[PDB]
Scaffold this active site. Structure first.
Site, PDB file in Angstrom:
ATOM      1  N   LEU A   1      15.285  -0.138 -34.071  1.00 58.58           N
ATOM      2  CA  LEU A   1      15.783   1.140 -33.592  1.00 58.58           C
ATOM      3  C   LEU A   1      17.444   1.372 -34.100  1.00 58.58           C
ATOM      4  O   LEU A   1      17.897   2.458 -34.160  1.00 58.58           O
ATOM      5  CB  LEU A   1      15.535   1.334 -32.253  1.00 58.58           C
ATOM      6  CG  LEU A   1      14.055   1.271 -31.837  1.00 58.58           C
ATOM      7  CD1 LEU A   1      13.937   1.535 -30.237  1.00 58.58           C
ATOM      8  CD2 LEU A   1      13.367   2.566 -32.565  1.00 58.58           C
ATOM      9  N   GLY A   2      17.842   0.278 -33.999  1.00 55.89           N
ATOM     10  CA  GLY A   2      19.280   0.309 -34.270  1.00 55.89           C
ATOM     11  C   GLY A   2      20.031  -1.293 -34.189  1.00 55.89           C
ATOM     12  O   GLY A   2      19.333  -2.194 -34.070  1.00 55.89           O
TER      13      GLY A   2
ATOM     14  N   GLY B   1      24.065  -3.116 -33.322  1.00 57.23           N
ATOM     15  CA  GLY B   1      25.636  -3.246 -32.236  1.00 57.23           C
ATOM     16  C   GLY B   1      26.435  -4.229 -32.966  1.00 57.23           C
ATOM     17  O   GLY B   1      26.699  -5.206 -32.377  1.00 57.23           O
TER      18      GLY B   1
ATOM     19  N   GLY C   1      24.802  -7.172 -31.401  1.00 54.54           N
ATOM     20  CA  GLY C   1      23.229  -7.489 -31.496  1.00 54.54           C
ATOM     21  C   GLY C   1      22.597  -6.434 -32.363  1.00 54.54           C
ATOM     22  O   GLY C   1      23.019  -5.844 -33.432  1.00 54.54           O
TER      23      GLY C   1
ATOM     24  N   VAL D   1      18.613  -3.623 -31.612  1.00 54.43           N
ATOM     25  CA  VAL D   1      17.699  -2.816 -30.769  1.00 54.43           C
ATOM     26  C   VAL D   1      16.532  -2.607 -31.203  1.00 54.43           C
ATOM     27  O   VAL D   1      16.442  -2.162 -32.706  1.00 54.43           O
ATOM     28  CB  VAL D   1      18.321  -1.246 -30.494  1.00 54.43           C
ATOM     29  CG1 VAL D   1      17.285  -0.646 -29.429  1.00 54.43           C
ATOM     30  CG2 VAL D   1      19.730  -1.262 -29.773  1.00 54.43           C
TER      31      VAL D   1
ATOM     32  N   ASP E   1      32.343   7.069 -23.919  1.00 48.45           N
ATOM     33  CA  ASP E   1      31.737   6.894 -25.306  1.00 48.45           C
ATOM     34  C   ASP E   1      30.645   7.858 -25.798  1.00 48.45           C
ATOM     35  O   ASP E   1      29.827   7.668 -26.625  1.00 48.45           O
ATOM     36  CB  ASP E   1      31.420   5.736 -26.178  1.00 48.45           C
ATOM     37  CG  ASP E   1      31.524   5.308 -27.387  1.00 48.45           C
ATOM     38  OD1 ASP E   1      32.309   5.977 -28.217  1.00 48.45           O
ATOM     39  OD2 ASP E   1      30.951   4.666 -28.236  1.00 48.45           O
TER      40      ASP E   1
END
Ligand SMILES: CCc1cc2c(cc1O[C@H]1CCOC1)Cc1c-2n[nH]c1-c1ccc(C#N)nc1
Length: 255
Positions: A13-14, A16, A17, A19, A115
């Site tokens: 899903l993404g 960063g 680590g 997701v 953010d």
């Protein structure tokens, strides 16, 4: 009941680590697993609101931390924004209402996200906006005592000018500002400046009220009147959320 604790990691899903989308072996319930911190889990344990990504729990398998968070199938608000166009004004207003509800909730429990941007605003199956990622979030109010902030946190195009100019600043007007930049991006499909500094020409043009230029030229006068109250350089003069809720465009019936 057996195997209800077992989760299969089905899709990324993404990063960063990272997701990953996890599906329960028995119930087929879908959750987002954040693989990585101590402050993020602590802040997440405090949260319970319909416009904030749900925290289901955490588990540590050695040096790796697993955060079990709400899966939002609608993806990021960022992907609903058409470059240089934006989105239909009624969609942007509904998302802006849900964004204000989420932010009022966080500020009410003394938390600042720090953010706010369309990448961190996720959408569920019914396109309900959810505030995501509390990795940069901090407590600004404790025992009814406000603590002024000083740390550089956020994403330059969404950061309020006081964060670059002042040693200390109030947390709440910083999140109000980033919400106004998100509103600009939803209505124009472009960010107004690289950063809110006097050296930035686009920022100077705005302070000189040159609204005949992009992105302002693409925005209707009623939501633009709201943006004139949010994107105010002086954070003490900037509109507060109770006053945003009284704004004419904020309360305009749109179809
Ligand atoms: C499948 C749609 C989609 C869902 C989701 C995302 C991104 C998504 O888009 C995919 C599709 C291609 O790019 C990524 C990212 C995501 C989702 N649900 N929860 C979360 C998510 C992400 C970070 C955090 C944190 N901290 N909490 C939840």
């Amino acid at each position: 009941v057996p195997f209800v604790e077992d989760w299969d990691l089905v899709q990324t899903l993404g990063e960063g680590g990272e997701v990953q989308l996890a599906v329960n072996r028995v119930t087929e319930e879908a959750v987002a697993v954040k693989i990585v911190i101590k402050k993020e889990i602590c802040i997440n344990k405090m949260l319970n609101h319909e416009n904030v990504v749900k925290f289901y729990g955490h588990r540590r398998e050695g040096n790796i931390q697993y955060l079990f968070l709400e899966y939002c199938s609608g993806g990021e608000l960022f992907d609903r924004i058409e470059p240089d166009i934006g989105m239909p004004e009624p969609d942007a207003q509904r998302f802006f209402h849900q964004l204000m509800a989420g932010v009022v909730y966080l500020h009410g429990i003394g938390i600042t996200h720090r953010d706010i941007k369309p990448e961190n605003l996720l959408l569920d199956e019914r396109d309900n906006l959810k505030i995501s990622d509390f990795g940069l979030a901090t407590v600004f109010r404790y025992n009814n005592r406000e603590r002024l902030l000083n740390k550089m946190c956020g994403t330059l195009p969404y950061v309020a000018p006081e964060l670059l100019k002042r040693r200390e600043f109030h947390a709440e007007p910083v999140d109000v500002w980033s919400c106004g930049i998100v509103l600009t991006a939803m209505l124009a499909g472009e960010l107004p400046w690289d950063q809110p500094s006097d050296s930035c020409q686009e920022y100077s043009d705005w302070k000189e009220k040159k609204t005949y230029l992009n992105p302002w030229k693409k925005i209707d006068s009623a939501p633009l009147a709201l943006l004139h109250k949010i994107l105010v350089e002086n954070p003490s003069a900037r509109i507060t959320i109770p006053d945003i809720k009284k704004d004419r465009w904020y309360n305009k019936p749109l179809k």
